[PDB]
Scaffold this active site. Structure first.
Site, short mmCIF file in Angstrom:
data_model
loop_
_atom_site.label_atom_id
_atom_site.label_comp_id
_atom_site.label_asym_id
_atom_site.label_seq_id
_atom_site.Cartn_x
_atom_site.Cartn_y
_atom_site.Cartn_z
N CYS A 1 44.64 38.90 36.54
CA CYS A 1 45.63 39.11 37.59
C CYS A 1 45.85 37.83 38.38
O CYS A 1 44.93 37.34 39.04
CB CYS A 1 45.19 40.24 38.52
SG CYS A 1 46.13 40.38 40.08
N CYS B 1 45.31 37.94 42.28
CA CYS B 1 43.86 37.93 42.52
C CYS B 1 43.31 36.51 42.53
O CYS B 1 42.56 36.12 43.42
CB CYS B 1 43.14 38.75 41.44
SG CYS B 1 43.39 40.51 41.57
#
Length: 116
Positions: free
Chosen positions: A41, A44
């Site tokens: 991600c 993230c």
């Protein structure tokens, strides 16, 4: 494992290890920030220096990192549907939630609950 800035974040790679940490926290009047992340991600990964700096500043707050594929059972228990999701827990109960790479919203919600 490498570091480019100070951090107090603890990563849990087993459900049992998280559950034991969570059970100990249930009885403590202490704020826990749970960062639900995924290795793939992008947002993230962009937030990692921000969360690391936050954890080194709010040293009275426990910062925890949980991968949603590794610990999919934990992610499903808390209804995580997008990453990063920051779950704020105190005395075993969710008190706030942030969904997405939102630094100011997270900091505001931490300050609301870091003290009695």
């Amino acid at each position: 494992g490498s570091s480019s800035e100070p951090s107090r974040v603890i990563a849990f790679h087993s459900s049992n290890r998280w559950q034991l940490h969570f059970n100990s926290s249930k009885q403590l009047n202490k704020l826990i920030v749970v960062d639900f992340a995924a290795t793939w991600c992008g947002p993230c990964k962009m937030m990692e220096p921000v969360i690391n700096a936050m954890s080194a500043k709010y040293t009275d707050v426990d910062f925890v990192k949980i991968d949603v594929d590794e610990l999919s059972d934990v992610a499903q228990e808390f209804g995580v549907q997008a990453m990063p999701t920051f779950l704020l827990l105190k005395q075993g109960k969710e008190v706030e939630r942030v969904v997405g790479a939102k630094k100011d919203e997270l900091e505001k919600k931490i300050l609301k609950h870091r003290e009695a």
